[PDB]
Amino acid sequence: DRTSLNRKLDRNLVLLVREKFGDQDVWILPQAEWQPGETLRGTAERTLATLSENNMEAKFLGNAPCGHYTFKFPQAMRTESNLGAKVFFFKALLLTGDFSQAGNKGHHVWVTKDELGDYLKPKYLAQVRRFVSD
Amino acid sequence: YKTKPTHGIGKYKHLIDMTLAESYAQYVHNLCNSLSIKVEESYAMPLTTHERVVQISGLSATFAEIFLEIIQSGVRLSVXXXXXXXXXXXXXXXX
Amino acid sequence: TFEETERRALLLKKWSLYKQQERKMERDTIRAMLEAQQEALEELQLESPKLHAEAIK
RNA sequence: CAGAGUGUAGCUUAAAAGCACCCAACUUACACUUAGGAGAUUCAAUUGACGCUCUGA
């Protein structure tokens, strides 16, 4: 399985989303699973657009497509689909686009690395985030 | 001597604002040196304005990206064209 | 003056001390990134080769 | 939270060393040189117990 992930930065503050309002008061980066018939970067951009609503410009692979199934794989408790799943990463820059909380998200803020929230762990782990920042 | 087993023992040929900007350039150069990249040349290009250059060649995409990020992390930049902000600086590449 | 010079030397020393720590930190950060990259490439190889190839380009 | 590899500061058929590294000056800058700077055997009697790397849950 394939999972695209982005890491958009501004003022040294990373952004976060709440898809599934009730379940996810906890935050993650704005990205779901792969999109067939479309290229990695492009797919990522599309995903971003769907969530954050902007034009987007992916720089390239920064230095950390994390994998995640290797290190701290999804939790055995609760019905979570624990399979072999790659976790591609991307560094990117926005050009223009105002935010809009509707449909597939509850909230959207920008936060420091040291000022980290609760965080899910299957998609993005705090440690993982730190590593990527480094 | 040619016919002796110590033939080519001697053989060697085959082995062979402005201030701020300047400082930034120096730093960049140092970084390059550290990371093992060929720094070819540096220029002293001409209110006032002042430009500095650090000519670089040969670096892989991931590594290159990392380098760029480090550079980003004041004044300005100019190399895909990758400009940014905080006199002048222009690290021209040749990947 | 003597006192000023003394002060200055100390200041310089302090600066030097500071700079090295920062440098070390930077190096560590770089290393982390490198490690991540290494991990990532391996993962890509394990999973799907075309994607890996694309990434490499 | 269960196992395996171990565990001299960045790194070594080192044994508290030598290489690396940092600041200033000379340097367009780099380089060289000259002055300075900072660093370590994770811890208790070859054994045990804290730290990583790695594999499971």
Side-chain angles (χ1 to χ4, degrees):
Chain A
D1 304 326
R2 285 181 278 206
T3 324
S4 174
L5 288 302
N6 297 83
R7 190 162 82 95
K8 192 162 75 176
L9 189 143
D10 61 318
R11 257 262 283 190
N12 290 327
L13 298 164
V14 187
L15 303 138
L16 292 168
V17 289
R18 292 188 208 149
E19 89 283 15
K20 309 293 98 182
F21 67 140
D23 194 279
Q24 297 284 352
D25 186 278
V26 169
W27 284 329
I28 53 166
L29 270 290
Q31 252 287 195
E33 203 149 23
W34 217 247
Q35 299 196 313
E38 290 275 39
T39 315
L40 330 95
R41 301 172 90 159
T43 64
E45 287 202 43
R46 260 76 222 183
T47 59
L48 233 169
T50 312
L51 274 61
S52 184
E53 196 180 308
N54 74 96
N55 304 17
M56 242 297 105
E57 252 197 312
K59 206 74 162 180
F60 207 47
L61 295 189
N63 219 212
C66 294
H68 224 120
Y69 179 47
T70 54
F71 263 60
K72 189 192 173 67
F73 68 93
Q75 204 134 55
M77 195 173 72
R78 190 68 66 179
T79 184
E80 291 183 315
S81 57
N82 190 215
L83 303 170
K86 70 157 62 172
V87 165
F88 254 118
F89 264 42
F90 278 116
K91 288 181 180 268
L93 300 89
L94 73 159
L95 299 305
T96 186
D98 304 18
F99 300 120
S100 288
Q101 291 135 9
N104 203 36
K105 47 160 59 176
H107 225 65
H108 195 243
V109 309
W110 46 99
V111 74
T112 325
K113 300 157 196 316
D114 188 91
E115 304 175 44
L116 216 72
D118 196 288
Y119 242 127
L120 218 184
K121 293 155 176 292
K123 288 283 189 178
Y124 257 63
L125 221 187
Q127 169 282 125
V128 170
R129 242 283 283 284
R130 185 70 178 208
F131 191 52
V132 69
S133 307
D134 279 47
Chain B
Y1 195 81
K2 273 178 180 180
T3 69
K4 290 278 138 282
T6 51
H7 183 354
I9 223 162
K11 213 174 186 174
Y12 57 69
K13 179 177 64 174
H14 69 105
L15 299 176
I16 299 165
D17 310 345
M18 65 185 287
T19 51
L20 280 165
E22 288 181 343
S23 188
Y24 189 76
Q26 265 192 200
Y27 179 103
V28 168
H29 206 308
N30 275 336
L31 199 23
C32 220
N33 284 357
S34 190
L35 299 164
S36 311
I37 323 174
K38 292 173 168 168
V39 180
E40 298 194 342
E41 290 193 70
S42 59
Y43 298 119
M45 297 188 73
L47 301 175
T48 54
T49 179
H50 282 86
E51 256 280 23
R52 291 296 313 284
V53 179
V54 177
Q55 270 192 79
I56 292 166
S57 298
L59 58 171
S60 59
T62 57
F63 171 43
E65 272 272 4
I66 260 204
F67 176 42
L68 213 173
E69 104 90 77
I70 200 162
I71 282 182
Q72 188 185 124
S73 59
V75 192
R76 295 194 182 183
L77 297 168
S78 54
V79 183
Chain C
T1 55
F2 165 93
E3 291 174 328
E4 192 180 59
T5 53
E6 198 260 354
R7 286 172 177 182
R8 276 181 173 182
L10 290 168
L11 288 168
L12 287 163
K13 284 172 175 185
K14 284 183 176 186
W15 220 158
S16 191
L17 264 160
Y18 276 120
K19 270 281 180 181
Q20 194 191 342
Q21 289 176 17
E22 290 183 0
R23 278 5 284 147
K24 287 177 226 169
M25 282 296 302
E26 289 285 329
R27 274 146 198 162
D28 298 341
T29 61
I30 291 158
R31 193 212 308 168
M33 290 200 161
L34 286 162
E35 280 151 7
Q37 211 279 316
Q38 284 173 308
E39 286 164 29
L41 286 186
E42 288 168 293
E43 280 148 353
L44 300 202
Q45 289 164 266
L46 286 161
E47 290 263 28
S48 63
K50 292 172 188 177
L51 293 202
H52 166 81
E54 285 147 30
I56 279 179
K57 289 168 193 175

